Design a protein around this ligand. Structure first.
Ligand SMILES: O=C(c1ccccc1)N1CCOCC1
Length: 209
């Protein structure tokens, strides 16, 4: 049972801008997704300080980066707070309408795309490198869901019958054909070292057979 939703017009406009603007410094997508994972992990950590049962779904707080060259996917897994179905529908838990407004003003006032995270909409930087993004998530107060979009103005939400996650979020980037450098170990290591060196959770880069 799959539900299809239209993006709000402002978010569709954000996504078109990210997809269509010539901008070479695409590697910042990974900084932005790791930062989102860190923010999610901070939220479940804070809730656990007064209610340790919040971690019954998983005590470890970490980020895994999983490249798969056969499927052409880079997956960012975290064990943070996750998202409810309502959060997924409401722009993946962001204030994306107001964030887009400010970001588009800033781009016209000199800013560049790399600044997207200062506007709370860094998730959408995934579309610098992905033709399709799938988000699998599990929040303590809801069931496991899959969100997906290839842009084009719509996204889907369905219950996920895949491997249960416990708690957290998995962002699966189905990379564009010309963006496969982001599956190479040396390139991922370089980006994490350059942009994510002060993230306070372990970031494990998985290797491939
Ligand atoms: O920062 C930029 C930017 C674009 C062109 C020239 C200088 C900067 N952007 C990223 C891509 O989307 C638009 C905003």
């Amino acid at each position: 049972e799959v539900e299809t939703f239209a993006f709000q017009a402002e978010i569709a406009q954000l996504m078109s801008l990210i997809i269509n603007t010539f901008y070479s410094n695409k590697e910042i997508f990974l900084r932005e997704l790791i930062s989102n994972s860190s923010d999610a992990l901070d939220k479940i950590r804070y809730e656990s300080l007064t209610d340790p049962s919040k971690l019954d779904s998983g005590k470890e707080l970490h980020i895994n980066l999983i490249p798969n060259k056969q499927d052409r996917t880079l997956t960012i897994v975290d064990t943070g707070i996750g998202m409810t179905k309502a959060d997924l529908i409401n722009n993946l838990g962001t204030i994306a309408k107001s964030g887009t407004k400010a970001f588009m003003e800033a781009l016209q006032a000199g800013a560049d795309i790399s600044m997207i995270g200062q506007f709370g909409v860094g998730f959408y930087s995934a579309y610098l490198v992905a033709e399709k993004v799938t988000v699998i998530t599990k929040h303590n107060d809801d069931e496991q869901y899959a969100w997906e979009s290839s842009a084009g103005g719509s996204f889907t939400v369905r219950t996920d019958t895949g491997e249960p996650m416990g708690r957290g979020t998995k962002v699966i980037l189905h990379l564009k054909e010309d963006q496969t450098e982001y599956l190479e170990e040396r390139r991922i290591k370089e980006i994490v070292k350059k942009h994510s060196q002060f993230i306070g959770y372990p970031i494990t880069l998985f290797v491939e057979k």
